[PDB]
Subunit: 293 residues, 2 copies
């Protein structure tokens, strides 16, 4: 009698649309299936090969490249997984196709104003999210059915978020193994501006530095074993994605670089003043914090 | 020809002194012993714990915390492996205590004027070296008997360098796995200023940024490897080692940081001014084959 928590659960989400059928879109589709989801998974992509590869791999049941065909799929759950620069335009087009009862959510690596813009486009259907997962992979062929297990997923509810959709999006992420927490859109963009965007910005600029400080007689790239090695991981990054993340989170990325410049300026001062003991303590305190994890 | 070359090497290294018995001094001691070396290995260190640990692990035959006692060791081959600013005053002491025929070399991460200062203190005894190998760990407990295997070692001979000792030091490094090349002391300090000292300075400051940008309600350290973790492994390195390197190589470290800043400033402006094409071109630089 009371056990019918089960039926509500099955009826809460029946036709799922993956927008952007790439690595993240496909890892989500796969992880969703692996958690025992029995409904339909549909794909929408501008690249018909993304759809082609995902269907034959069994990752979606069917898909399309015409936005207007999406309507035939009557999705009630949408996971935005294209580049974040596409989200506004696509959400414009979903806003008419989707029933008032649909839920839209996303995996976008930036939140901030984008969440407010998406909720204004989509009314009440929208819940912002960011799974702190990722690797340096692209394309559905690389999608993993456990990408999210044991990782943080940040949802960014507002005063406008629908509590039952927030709660569903939370539960769907936990079914795939994620650990959910909440941050405002603005706090999210500050936090990840600092812990994620800044570190990439600074790896980018390091590479640029070794290029202009090399001379015709000296290729500095020949000497990676002195500390530069870990920074060369930046070679695996996608320049277009970073370009878009930098632009979209510009105000937080600039604040983060600013606080970085303050830290580096402090280190220069200790160096030039030969502050022997201060310099040790500066390095010791960063040592301890970095070791905690 | 091999027999003899080997005899000569043996005889010229009966008594090795490791000065600073920590991660690099221990790695050197273990590497030498793994390579089949048969003489004595002694340790001298300011920390008595460094000595007893190294003895207990069978890394050195014997050691001491008194520089005077080094004379009883009659070292003929000394590998300086303490923090780089300890070298001058240690050398001064050694010059009285070591025989004229001994070789003194080093593992320090800075060369530059220190090579010259050390040649003036030690005379013909001295050969400047720097193995480009290490991790963030420090202390003899972390040392490894294959640390230098297949790694570059830079020697910095000058006008004044004794050729026999240069050949000796080179073959010792190649014996433990290293691949030797030469640079001038000054070229060394500019190369490694940019490629090793600046990336460390950058990693340290990155972690420091998360400290001050944190609030009591938001601990930025709860969110690591949004990529931070990968780029700051080297910010767990030793504060004394790194304080010494930054001060000893101060002018190059400043020149490297100034270079970096101009790159960072270029990047900022591309971001601020939303230059889609130029920004993506700048970022594409990580794809270069070098
Ligand atoms: N890669 C990561 O480490 C990572 C981590 C966390 C979050 N994210 C987020 O995941 C999203 C996509 O990332 P990905 O790594 O899967 O990229 P991806 O390259 O693997 O795939 C994106 C897919 O979107 C499709 N696409 C591109 N433009 C489109 C448009 N106009 N309409 C519909 N589809 C379009 C592509 O054709 C491709 O099939 C981004 O929003 C990114 O911020 C990525
Ligand atoms: N750690 C690395 O990656 C690495 C790589 C290449 C070169 N180096 C250079 O190696 C040398 C040793 O570094 P490490 O990583 O072995 O450091 P470490 O902390 O592991 O060891 C340093 C040792 O020297 C001792 N010491 C400190 N002051 C001394 C003094 N006044 N006299 C005698 N001993 C003293 C300490 O007690 C300790 O046992 C430094 O010059 C460093 O720049 C380090
Ligand atoms: N410890 C650095 C590598 C390194 C190599 C040579 C040095 O002189 C200093 C540091 C990593 O880990």
């Amino acid at each position: 009698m009371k056990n019918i928590i089960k039926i509500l659960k099955s009826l809460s989400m029946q036709n799922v649309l993956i927008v952007g059928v790439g690595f993240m879109g496909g890892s989500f589709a796969k992880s969703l299936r692996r958690s025992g989801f029995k409904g339909k998974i549909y794909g929408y992509d501008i690249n018909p090969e993304s759809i082609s590869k995902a269907v034959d791999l069994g990752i979606i049941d069917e898909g399309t490249t015409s936005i207007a065909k999406v309507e035939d799929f009557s999705p009630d759950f949408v996971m935005l997984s294209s580049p974040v620069r596409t989200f506004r335009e696509i959400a414009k087009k979903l806003s008419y196709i989707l029933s008032e009862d649909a839920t839209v959510t996303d995996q976008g690596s930036v939140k901030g104003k984008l969440v407010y813009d998406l909720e204004n486009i989509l009314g009440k259907r929208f819940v912002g999210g960011h799974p702190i997962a990722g690797t340096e992979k692209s394309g559905v062929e690389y999608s993993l059915d456990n990408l999210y297990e044991g990782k943080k997923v940040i949802l960014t509810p507002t005063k406008k978020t629908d509590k039952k959709r927030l709660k569903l999006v939370k539960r769907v992420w936990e079914d795939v193994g994620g650990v959910v927490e909440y941050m405002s859109p603005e706090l999210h963009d500050y936090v990840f501006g600092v812990v994620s965007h800044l570190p990439h910005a600074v790896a980018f600029a390091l590479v640029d530095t070794l290029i202009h400080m090399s001379t015709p007689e000296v290729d500095l790239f020949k000497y990676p074993g002195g500390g530069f090695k870990d920074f060369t991981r930046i070679a695996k990054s996608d320049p277009i994605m970073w370009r878009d993340i930098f632009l979209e989170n510009k105000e937080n990325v600039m604040k983060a670089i600013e606080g970085f410049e303050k830290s580096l300026n402090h280190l220069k001062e200790l160096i030039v003043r030969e502050a022997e003991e201060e310099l040790v303590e500066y390095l010791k305190e960063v040592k301890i914090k970095r070791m905690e994890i």
